[PDB]
Amino acid sequence: XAXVXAXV
């Protein structure tokens, strides 16, 4: 759920 390297 967080976006810092993938964003899901």
Place this chain on the structure above:
DNA sequence: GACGTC
């Protein structure tokens, strides 16, 4: 070494 929701 750093972040959590569809």
Place this chain on the structure above:
DNA sequence: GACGTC
């Protein structure tokens, strides 16, 4: 249970 880039 899914997703890695600075």
